[PDB]
Every structure is written in C-alpha cells, then in structure tokens.
Coordinates of C-alpha atoms and ligand atoms in Angstrom, one line a residue:
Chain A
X1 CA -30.1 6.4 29.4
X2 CA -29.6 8.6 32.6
X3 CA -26.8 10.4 31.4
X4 CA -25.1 10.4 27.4
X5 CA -22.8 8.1 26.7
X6 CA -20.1 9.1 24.5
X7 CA -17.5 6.8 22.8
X8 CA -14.0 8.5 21.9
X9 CA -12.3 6.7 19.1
X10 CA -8.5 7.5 18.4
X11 CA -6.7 6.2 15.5
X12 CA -3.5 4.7 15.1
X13 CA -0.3 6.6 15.8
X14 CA -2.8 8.5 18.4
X15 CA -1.3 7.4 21.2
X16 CA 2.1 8.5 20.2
X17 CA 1.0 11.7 21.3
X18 CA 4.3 13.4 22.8
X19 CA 6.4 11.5 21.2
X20 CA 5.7 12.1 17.6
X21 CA 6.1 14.9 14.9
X22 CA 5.5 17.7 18.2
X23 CA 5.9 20.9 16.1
X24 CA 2.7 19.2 14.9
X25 CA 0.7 17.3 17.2
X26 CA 1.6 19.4 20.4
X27 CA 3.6 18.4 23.6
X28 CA 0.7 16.7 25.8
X29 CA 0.5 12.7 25.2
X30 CA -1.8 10.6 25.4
X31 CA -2.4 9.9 28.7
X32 CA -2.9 14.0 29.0
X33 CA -5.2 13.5 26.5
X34 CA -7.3 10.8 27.9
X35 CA -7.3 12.6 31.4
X36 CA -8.4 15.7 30.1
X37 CA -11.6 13.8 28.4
X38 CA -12.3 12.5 31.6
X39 CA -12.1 15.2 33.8
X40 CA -14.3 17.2 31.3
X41 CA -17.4 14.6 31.1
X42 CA -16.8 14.1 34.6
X43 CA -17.8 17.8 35.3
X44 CA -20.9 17.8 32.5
X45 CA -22.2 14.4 34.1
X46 CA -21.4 12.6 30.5
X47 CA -19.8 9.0 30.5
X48 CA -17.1 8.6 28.5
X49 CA -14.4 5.7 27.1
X50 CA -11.6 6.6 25.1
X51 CA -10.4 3.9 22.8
X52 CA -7.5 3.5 20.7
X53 CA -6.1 1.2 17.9
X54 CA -3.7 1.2 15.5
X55 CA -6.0 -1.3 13.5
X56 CA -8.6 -0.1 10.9
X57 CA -10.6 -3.3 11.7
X58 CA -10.8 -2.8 15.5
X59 CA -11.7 0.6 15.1
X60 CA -14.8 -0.6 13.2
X61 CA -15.2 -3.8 15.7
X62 CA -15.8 -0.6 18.1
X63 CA -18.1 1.3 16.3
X64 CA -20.3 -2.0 15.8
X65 CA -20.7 -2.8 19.7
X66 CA -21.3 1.0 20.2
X67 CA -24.8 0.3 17.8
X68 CA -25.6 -2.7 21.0
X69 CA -24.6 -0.6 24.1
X70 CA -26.6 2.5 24.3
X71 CA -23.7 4.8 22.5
X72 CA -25.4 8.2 21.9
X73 CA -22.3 10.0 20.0
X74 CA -18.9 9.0 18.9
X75 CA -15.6 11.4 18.9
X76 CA -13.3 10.1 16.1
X77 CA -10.1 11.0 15.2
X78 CA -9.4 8.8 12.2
X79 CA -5.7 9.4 12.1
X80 CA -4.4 8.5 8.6
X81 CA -6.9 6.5 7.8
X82 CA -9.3 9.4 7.5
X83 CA -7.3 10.0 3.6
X84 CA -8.3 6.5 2.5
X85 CA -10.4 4.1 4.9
X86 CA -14.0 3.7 3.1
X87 CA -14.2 0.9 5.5
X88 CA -14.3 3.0 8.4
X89 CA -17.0 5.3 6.4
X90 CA -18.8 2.9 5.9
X91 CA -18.9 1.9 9.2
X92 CA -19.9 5.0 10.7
X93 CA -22.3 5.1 8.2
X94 CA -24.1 1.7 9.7
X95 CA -25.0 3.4 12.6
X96 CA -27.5 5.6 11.6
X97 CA -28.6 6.7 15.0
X98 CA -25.2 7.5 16.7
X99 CA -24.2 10.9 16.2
X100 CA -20.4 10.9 15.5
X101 CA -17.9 14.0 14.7
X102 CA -14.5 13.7 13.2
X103 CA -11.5 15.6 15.2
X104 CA -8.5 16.4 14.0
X105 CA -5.3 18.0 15.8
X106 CA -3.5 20.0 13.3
X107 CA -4.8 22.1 10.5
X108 CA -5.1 19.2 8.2
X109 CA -5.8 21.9 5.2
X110 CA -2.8 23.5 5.3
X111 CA -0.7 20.2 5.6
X112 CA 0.8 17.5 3.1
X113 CA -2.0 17.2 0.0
X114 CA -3.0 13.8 1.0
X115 CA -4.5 15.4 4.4
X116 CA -6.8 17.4 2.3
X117 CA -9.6 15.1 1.7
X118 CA -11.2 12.8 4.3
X119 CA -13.2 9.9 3.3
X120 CA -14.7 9.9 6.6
X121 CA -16.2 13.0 6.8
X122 CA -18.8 12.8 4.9
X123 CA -21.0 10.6 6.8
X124 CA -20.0 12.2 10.1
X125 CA -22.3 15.2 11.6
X126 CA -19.7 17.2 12.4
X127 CA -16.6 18.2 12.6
X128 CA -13.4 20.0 13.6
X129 CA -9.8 20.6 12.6
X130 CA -7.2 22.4 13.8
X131 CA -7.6 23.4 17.2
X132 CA -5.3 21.0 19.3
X133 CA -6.4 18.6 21.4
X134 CA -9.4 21.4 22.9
X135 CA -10.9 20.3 19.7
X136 CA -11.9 16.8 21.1
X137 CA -13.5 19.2 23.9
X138 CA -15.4 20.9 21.4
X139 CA -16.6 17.8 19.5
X140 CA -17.9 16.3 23.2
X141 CA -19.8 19.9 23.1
X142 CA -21.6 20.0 19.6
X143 CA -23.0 16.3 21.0
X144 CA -23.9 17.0 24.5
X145 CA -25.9 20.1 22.3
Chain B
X1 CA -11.7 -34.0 -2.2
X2 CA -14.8 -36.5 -2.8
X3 CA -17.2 -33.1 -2.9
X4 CA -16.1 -29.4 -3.6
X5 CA -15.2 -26.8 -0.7
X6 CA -16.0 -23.6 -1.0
X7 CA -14.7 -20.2 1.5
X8 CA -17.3 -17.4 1.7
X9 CA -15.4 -14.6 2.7
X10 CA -17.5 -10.9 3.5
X11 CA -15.3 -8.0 4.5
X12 CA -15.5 -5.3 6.7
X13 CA -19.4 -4.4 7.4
X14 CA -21.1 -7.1 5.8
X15 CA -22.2 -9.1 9.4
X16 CA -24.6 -5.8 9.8
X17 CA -26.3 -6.3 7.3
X18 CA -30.4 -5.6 7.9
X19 CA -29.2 -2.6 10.1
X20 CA -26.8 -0.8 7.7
X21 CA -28.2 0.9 4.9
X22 CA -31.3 -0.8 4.3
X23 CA -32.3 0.4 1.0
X24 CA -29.2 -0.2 -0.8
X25 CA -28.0 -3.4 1.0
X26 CA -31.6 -4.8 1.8
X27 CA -33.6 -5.9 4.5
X28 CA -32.1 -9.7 5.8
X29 CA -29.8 -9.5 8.3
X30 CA -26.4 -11.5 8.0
X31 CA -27.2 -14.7 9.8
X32 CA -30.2 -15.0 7.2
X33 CA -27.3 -14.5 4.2
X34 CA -25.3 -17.5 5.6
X35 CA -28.2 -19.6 6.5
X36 CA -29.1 -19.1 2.1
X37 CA -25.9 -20.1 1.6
X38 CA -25.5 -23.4 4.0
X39 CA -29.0 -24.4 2.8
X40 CA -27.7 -24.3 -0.9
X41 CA -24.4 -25.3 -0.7
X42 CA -25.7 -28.7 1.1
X43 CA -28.5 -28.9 -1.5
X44 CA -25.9 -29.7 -4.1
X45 CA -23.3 -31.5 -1.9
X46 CA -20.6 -28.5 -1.8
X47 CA -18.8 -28.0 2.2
X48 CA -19.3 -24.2 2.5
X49 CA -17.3 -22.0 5.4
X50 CA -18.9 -18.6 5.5
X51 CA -16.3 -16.4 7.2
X52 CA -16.5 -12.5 7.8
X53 CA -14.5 -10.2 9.0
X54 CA -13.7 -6.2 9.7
X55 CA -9.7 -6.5 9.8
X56 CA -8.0 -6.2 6.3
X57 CA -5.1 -8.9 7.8
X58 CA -7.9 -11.7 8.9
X59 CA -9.0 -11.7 5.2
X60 CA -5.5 -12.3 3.8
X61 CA -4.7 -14.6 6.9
X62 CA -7.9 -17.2 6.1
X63 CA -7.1 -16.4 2.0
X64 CA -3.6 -17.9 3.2
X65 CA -5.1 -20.9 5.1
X66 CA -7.0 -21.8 1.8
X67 CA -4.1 -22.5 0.1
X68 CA -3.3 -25.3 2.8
X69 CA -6.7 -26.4 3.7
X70 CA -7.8 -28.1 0.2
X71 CA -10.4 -24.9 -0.5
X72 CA -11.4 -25.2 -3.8
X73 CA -13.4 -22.0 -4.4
X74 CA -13.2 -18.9 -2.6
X75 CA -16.4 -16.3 -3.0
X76 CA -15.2 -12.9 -1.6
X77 CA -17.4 -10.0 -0.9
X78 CA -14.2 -7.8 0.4
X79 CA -16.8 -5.2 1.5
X80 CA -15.2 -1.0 1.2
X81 CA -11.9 -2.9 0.9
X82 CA -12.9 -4.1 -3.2
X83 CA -11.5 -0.2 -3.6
X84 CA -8.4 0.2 -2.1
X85 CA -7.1 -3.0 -0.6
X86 CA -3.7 -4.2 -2.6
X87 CA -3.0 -6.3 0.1
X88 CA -6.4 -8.5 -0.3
X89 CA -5.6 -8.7 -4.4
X90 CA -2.0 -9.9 -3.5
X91 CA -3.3 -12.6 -1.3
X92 CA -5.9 -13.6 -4.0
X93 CA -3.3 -13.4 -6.6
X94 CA -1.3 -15.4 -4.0
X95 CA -3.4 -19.0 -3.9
X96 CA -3.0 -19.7 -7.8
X97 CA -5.2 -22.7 -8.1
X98 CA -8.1 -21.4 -6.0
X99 CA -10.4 -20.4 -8.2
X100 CA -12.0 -16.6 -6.9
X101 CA -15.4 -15.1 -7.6
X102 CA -16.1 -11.2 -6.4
X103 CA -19.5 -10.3 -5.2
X104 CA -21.6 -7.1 -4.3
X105 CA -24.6 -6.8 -3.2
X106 CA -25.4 -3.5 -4.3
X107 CA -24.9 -2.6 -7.9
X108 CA -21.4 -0.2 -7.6
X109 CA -21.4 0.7 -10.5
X110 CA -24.3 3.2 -10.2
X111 CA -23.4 4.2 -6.3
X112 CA -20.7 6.8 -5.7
X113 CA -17.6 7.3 -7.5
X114 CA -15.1 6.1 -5.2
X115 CA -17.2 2.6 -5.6
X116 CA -17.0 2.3 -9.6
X117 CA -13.2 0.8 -9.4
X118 CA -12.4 -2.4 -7.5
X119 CA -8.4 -3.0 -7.5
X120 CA -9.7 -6.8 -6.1
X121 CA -11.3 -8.2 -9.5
X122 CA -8.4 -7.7 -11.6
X123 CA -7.0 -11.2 -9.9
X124 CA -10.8 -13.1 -9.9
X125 CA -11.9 -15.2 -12.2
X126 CA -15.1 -13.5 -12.1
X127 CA -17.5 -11.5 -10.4
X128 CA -21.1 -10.7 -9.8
X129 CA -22.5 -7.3 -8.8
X130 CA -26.3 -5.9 -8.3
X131 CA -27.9 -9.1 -7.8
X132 CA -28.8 -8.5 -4.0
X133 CA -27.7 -11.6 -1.8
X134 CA -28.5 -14.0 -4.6
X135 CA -25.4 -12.8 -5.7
X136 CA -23.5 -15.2 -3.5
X137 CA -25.3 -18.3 -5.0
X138 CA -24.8 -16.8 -8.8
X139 CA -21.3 -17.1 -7.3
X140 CA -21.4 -20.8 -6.2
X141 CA -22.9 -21.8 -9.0
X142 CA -19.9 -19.9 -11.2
X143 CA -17.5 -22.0 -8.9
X144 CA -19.9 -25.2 -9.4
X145 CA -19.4 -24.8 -13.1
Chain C
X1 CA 23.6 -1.2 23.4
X2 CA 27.0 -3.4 23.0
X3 CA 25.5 -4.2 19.2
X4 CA 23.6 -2.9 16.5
X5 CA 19.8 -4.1 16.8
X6 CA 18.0 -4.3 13.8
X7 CA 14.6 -5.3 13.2
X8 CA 13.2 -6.8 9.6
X9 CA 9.7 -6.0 9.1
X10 CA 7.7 -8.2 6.2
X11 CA 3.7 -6.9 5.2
X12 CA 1.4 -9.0 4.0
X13 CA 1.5 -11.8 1.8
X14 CA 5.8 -11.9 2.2
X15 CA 5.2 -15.0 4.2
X16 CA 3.9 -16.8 0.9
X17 CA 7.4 -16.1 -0.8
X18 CA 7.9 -19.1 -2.8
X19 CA 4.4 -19.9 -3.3
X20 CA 2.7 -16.3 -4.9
X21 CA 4.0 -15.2 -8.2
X22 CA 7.0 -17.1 -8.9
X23 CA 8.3 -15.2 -11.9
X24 CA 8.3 -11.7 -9.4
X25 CA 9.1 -12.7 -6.3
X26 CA 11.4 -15.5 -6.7
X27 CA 11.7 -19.0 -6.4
X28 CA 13.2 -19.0 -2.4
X29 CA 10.5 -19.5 0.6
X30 CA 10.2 -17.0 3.8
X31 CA 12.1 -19.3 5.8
X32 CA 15.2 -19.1 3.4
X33 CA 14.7 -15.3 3.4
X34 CA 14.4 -15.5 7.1
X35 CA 17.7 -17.8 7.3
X36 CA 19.4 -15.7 5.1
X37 CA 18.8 -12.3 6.9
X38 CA 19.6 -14.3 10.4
X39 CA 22.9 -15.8 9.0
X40 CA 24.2 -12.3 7.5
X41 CA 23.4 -10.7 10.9
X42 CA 25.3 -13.2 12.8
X43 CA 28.7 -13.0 10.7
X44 CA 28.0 -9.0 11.1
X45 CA 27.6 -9.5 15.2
X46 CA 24.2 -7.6 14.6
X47 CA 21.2 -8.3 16.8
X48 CA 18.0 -8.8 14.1
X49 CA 14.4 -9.8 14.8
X50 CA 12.0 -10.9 11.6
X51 CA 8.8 -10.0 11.9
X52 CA 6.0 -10.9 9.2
X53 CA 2.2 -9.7 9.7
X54 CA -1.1 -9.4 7.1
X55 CA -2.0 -6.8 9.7
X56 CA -1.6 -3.2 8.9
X57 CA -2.2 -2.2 12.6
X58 CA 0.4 -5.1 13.9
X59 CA 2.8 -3.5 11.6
X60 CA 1.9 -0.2 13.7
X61 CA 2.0 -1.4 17.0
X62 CA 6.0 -3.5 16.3
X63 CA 7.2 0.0 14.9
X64 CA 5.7 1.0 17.8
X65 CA 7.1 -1.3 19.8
X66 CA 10.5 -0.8 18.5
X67 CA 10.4 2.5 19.9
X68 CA 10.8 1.6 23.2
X69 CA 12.8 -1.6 23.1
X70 CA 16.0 -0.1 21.9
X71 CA 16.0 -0.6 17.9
X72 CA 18.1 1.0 16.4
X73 CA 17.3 0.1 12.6
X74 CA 14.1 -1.2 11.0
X75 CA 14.3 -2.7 7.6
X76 CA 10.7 -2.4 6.0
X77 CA 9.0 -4.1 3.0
X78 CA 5.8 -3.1 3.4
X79 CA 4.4 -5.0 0.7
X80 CA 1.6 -3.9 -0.9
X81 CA 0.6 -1.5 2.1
X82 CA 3.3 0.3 0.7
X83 CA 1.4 1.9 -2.1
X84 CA -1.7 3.5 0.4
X85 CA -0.9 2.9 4.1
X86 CA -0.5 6.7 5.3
X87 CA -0.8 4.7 8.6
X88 CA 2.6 2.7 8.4
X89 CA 4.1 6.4 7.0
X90 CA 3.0 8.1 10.1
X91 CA 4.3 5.3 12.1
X92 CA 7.7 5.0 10.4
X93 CA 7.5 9.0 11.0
X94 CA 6.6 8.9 15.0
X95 CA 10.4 7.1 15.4
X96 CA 12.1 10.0 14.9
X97 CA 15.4 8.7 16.2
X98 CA 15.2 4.8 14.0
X99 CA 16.5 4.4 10.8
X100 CA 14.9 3.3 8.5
X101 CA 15.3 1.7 5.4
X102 CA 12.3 0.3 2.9
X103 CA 12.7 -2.5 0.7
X104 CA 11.5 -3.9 -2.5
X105 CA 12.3 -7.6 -3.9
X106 CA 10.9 -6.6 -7.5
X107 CA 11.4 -3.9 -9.4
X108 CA 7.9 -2.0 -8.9
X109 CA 9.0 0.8 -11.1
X110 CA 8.4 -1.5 -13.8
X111 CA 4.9 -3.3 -12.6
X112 CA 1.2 -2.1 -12.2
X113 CA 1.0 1.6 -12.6
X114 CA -0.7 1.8 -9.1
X115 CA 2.9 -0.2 -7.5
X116 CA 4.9 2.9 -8.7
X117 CA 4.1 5.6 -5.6
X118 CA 4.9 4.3 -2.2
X119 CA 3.9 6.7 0.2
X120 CA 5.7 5.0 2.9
X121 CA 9.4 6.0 1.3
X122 CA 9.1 9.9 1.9
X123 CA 9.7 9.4 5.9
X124 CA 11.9 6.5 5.3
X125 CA 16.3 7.2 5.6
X126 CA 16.7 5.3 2.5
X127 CA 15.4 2.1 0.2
X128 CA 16.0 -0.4 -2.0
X129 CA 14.1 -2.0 -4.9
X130 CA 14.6 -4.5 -8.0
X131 CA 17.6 -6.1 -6.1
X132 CA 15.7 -9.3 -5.0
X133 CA 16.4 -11.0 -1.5
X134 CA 19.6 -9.4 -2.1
X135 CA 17.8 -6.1 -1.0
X136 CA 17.4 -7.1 2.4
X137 CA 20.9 -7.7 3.0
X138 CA 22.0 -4.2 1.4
X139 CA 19.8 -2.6 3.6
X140 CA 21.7 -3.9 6.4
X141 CA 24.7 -2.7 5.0
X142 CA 22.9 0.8 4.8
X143 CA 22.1 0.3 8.3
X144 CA 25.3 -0.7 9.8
X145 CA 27.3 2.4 8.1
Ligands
3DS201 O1 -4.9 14.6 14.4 C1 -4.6 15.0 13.3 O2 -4.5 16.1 12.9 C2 -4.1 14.0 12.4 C3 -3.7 12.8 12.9 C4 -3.1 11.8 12.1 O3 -2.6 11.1 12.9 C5 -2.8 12.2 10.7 O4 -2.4 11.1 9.8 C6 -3.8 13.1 10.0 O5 -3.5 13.5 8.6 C7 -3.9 14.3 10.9
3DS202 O1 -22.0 -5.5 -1.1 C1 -21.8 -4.5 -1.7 O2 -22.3 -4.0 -2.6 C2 -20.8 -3.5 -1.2 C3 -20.5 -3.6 0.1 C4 -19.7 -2.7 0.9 O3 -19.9 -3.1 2.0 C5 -19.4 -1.5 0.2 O4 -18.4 -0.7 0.7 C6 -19.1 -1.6 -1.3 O5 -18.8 -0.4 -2.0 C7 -20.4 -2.2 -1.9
3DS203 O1 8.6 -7.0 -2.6 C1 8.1 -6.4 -3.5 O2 8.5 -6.0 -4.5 C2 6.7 -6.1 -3.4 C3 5.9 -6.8 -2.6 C4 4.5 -6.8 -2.5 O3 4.3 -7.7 -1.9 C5 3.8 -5.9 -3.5 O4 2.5 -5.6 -3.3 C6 4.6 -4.7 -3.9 O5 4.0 -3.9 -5.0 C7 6.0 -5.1 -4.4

C-alpha cells in the first residue's frame, strides 16, 4: 500500500509483562510495550497492530488473515511455543510473501535447555534475541529495510 | 444409523491449502478437498462432516462430540499437531468405538525429521500417508470396509 | 480473604473421566470428581472453583485470570499438556505468589515412556500422582497447610 503494514504477534504469557519472572523479562509491561511499538511506527509512517494470545491456534488464525489484508511483515515473539509449536511453523511458513522475524526478550541461549532450539525459526527471515523489549524495535527495522 | 457417518477432521493449516506450499501439498485449494469428499461420500450413501480447524482444543472438543453424536468414523488429518499433540491422541484414544483413520497429504516419511514420528497413529486403526488428497477417500473407503 | 480460595484446573480430555480408558482413569465420571472436590471443600470452609478446558490457551488465560481474582491455590492436572506445554509452565511460573500443586490420577511413572517428564512440575510448589481421584483431595490438604 501507501505505507507498510506490519503485524506484531505476542505469544502467550506476553502480556504478563511486569508481572512475571522480572529479573528476566524486565520491569515494563505490556501496555509499555505496545505504546512503545506505536509511538515508533508512528514516527517512521509504518501502521502497526499488536496482537496477543495465549492460544497457539489464534496466533495462527492471525497469521492466516494477515495473507488476505495487505500484511507486508510480521514481528513474532512465539513465547514458549517457539520450543515446540510446528504448527505455528508451519503457519508462517504458508505465507510465503510476508516477511516475518522472531523476537525474543531474554537471551534464550543462555537460559533453561529447552529455550535453546526454536522450531520457528527456521522459516522466519530474521531474527533477534536478547536485547529487551528494543529488540521488537529492531525487528520493525530489519522490515521497514 | 440407517447409513454410515463419517467426521473429517484437518488440523491446523490444512484450509490453506493451494496457497501453502504448493509443491509438497499440491495445487487445489481446500474448498476443492471437501467438495471430493462430499461428492464421494454421497456417491456411496455415507453423511460426511468435513471440519477443520487451527486450535489444538476445537479438535479434541468436536473428537468429544463424536462420541455423543452417533459418528461412526472419524478421518483425521491433525495437520503439524500428528507430532507433538498428546492431547489429540488422548481424545482419539478417548471415543473407543469410533473407528479412526490418519491421513497426510504429503509423504512424512521422506520430509524433515521432526515429521517422521506421529505420537497420533499409535491410537488409529490406520492410516494413509503420500497419497496426495486421495488420501482422504483411501480413508473412507478403510472406514467403509 | 475471610477463606482459603482454591481453584481446580482439569486439561483436556478430564471431562471424559468415566468414559476414556477405564482400566487408568477409573470407573467415576467428571461430575462425581467435580462433586467430590466441591463437597471436601465445603466441610473444609474452602472457596473452590472447577474449571475443565481442551484448550491449552484457556488454561493460560484462567491461571491468568487467577492472578487477579484473589486465588490463592490452584490445583492442576494438566492432562496430557503436561508432558510438552512449556506454555502452561510459564504460566504456572508468571503467579509468583499462587500455590500450586499438580496432579496425576494414574501413576504415569509407570505408562508411555513419553508420560514420564512433565515439564509443568519444575515451577509447580508440589504434586501428586498414582493416588487416583484421591489426589485431588490431598492436594487440597497440601494447600490448606
Ligand atoms: O521473550 C522471550 O525471551 C521468551 C518468552 C517466553 O515467553 C519464553 O517461553 C521463551 O523461552 C523466551
Ligand atoms: O498433510 C500432510 O502431509 C501434512 C500436513 C501438515 O500440515 C504438516 O505439518 C505435516 O507434517 C504433514
Ligand atoms: O490424570 C492422569 O494421570 C493423566 C491424565 C492425562 O489425561 C494423561 O495424558 C496423562 O499422561 C496422565
């Protein structure tokens, strides 16, 4: 369109930012979150929506109406399902012509052994780990690239 | 009943078919896949419900109204879930007198790793794989037997 | 508050107690689990919500919920979620200040090598297994010492 359209999918427990596991996570929640998302595509003349369910099969109902409504990128943080959701892989992988990166808040390599490995990963473009919540800032920047 | 009912269940994914993947999961799009199957299943006087979902719970849920709705046959393409869903086996194991075929479209045995074990078929009383979307009526025709 | 509140949390396929696997799970329905759990509570002058869902994410969001709504306790079978929902751990992990206490009616130490690992337990206060609807009523207990 006139402008890119950007989709920001958050996982479950996501917004439980604040609240949960802080030493972790950070202080922020997820309102802050959201806000800050805003605020930044505001100011790069990007549309955005952040989304977030605690349900594996809404997060892929969300990627399929992204394919019918002109979604240029998506910004996913998995949460735990990124260790074990093939469905969500293989939903990202049906939309072949959306450019999606993975975010994650914490250093996930340095964590519990199940955080090592995402199944979602592998069909995404890009990601990041481990930089707070600036790294959903950065994942906005390697789309609008 | 006086003629046989049948549940077609596909998992998470399956309604895009003809935009996911094409050279794996082929080139007909889901609403052709459930037309096949209405066309044959009233060819040989069987009531067919083709049912799909993304959500892992809706599965089990309309595996659960099966057991009170007089569903003889259940065919269930469970999608990424045939890898890691316990909770869909449990609900198969669940509805002891409905008989349960497996299907996939693709032949998972020669995709990637991850796709070589399904913790579903262990509870069917058989299965089909690599047969493209004649795959479903190999199914019927199992249950028809 | 003036009483304890508790709430019971059943996964998927607990509702078809009575019904699924006979020789495991026993020979009493939901509704008498349900009864039982409501009676103990009563003669105990605890407060208890049961709460059954297929849904993964519904399980998220009443953890969630329980959060805010002044729970004290959550007794959690998870069913067989139990065995790869990192989801329901990080939930169970994001109430920092619930107890909580998982709970097995079989003995799944002795099953399926893949019903062995729970990866819900390691943020759970306590559990319970191999005790049958018995279990739910000693984790009460282990609640209301
Ligand atoms: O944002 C993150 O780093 C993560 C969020 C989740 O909620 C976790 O289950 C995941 O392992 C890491
Ligand atoms: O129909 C199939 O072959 C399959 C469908 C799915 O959607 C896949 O995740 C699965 O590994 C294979
Ligand atoms: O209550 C139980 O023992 C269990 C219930 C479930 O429904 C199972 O998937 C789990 O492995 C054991």
């Amino acid at each position: 369109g006139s402008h890119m359209k950007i989709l920001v999918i958050n996982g479950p427990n996501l917004n439980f930012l604040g609240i949960r596991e802080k030493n972790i996570y950070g202080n922020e929640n997820y309102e802050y979150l959201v806000n800050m998302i805003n605020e930044y595509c505001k100011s790069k003349n990007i549309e955005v929506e952040c989304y977030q369910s605690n349900h594996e099969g809404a997060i892929i109902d969300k990627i399929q109406e992204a394919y019918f409504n002109g979604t240029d990128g998506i910004v996913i943080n998995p949460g735990a399902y990124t260790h074990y959701s093939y469905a969500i892989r293989d939903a990202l992988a049906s939309v072949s012509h959306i450019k999606k990166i993975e975010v994650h808040i914490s250093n996930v390599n340095e964590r519990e052994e199940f955080r090592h490995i995402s199944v979602t990963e592998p069909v995404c473009n890009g990601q990041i780990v481990g930089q707070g919540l600036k790294g959903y800032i950065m994942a906005i920047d390697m789309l609008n690239s």
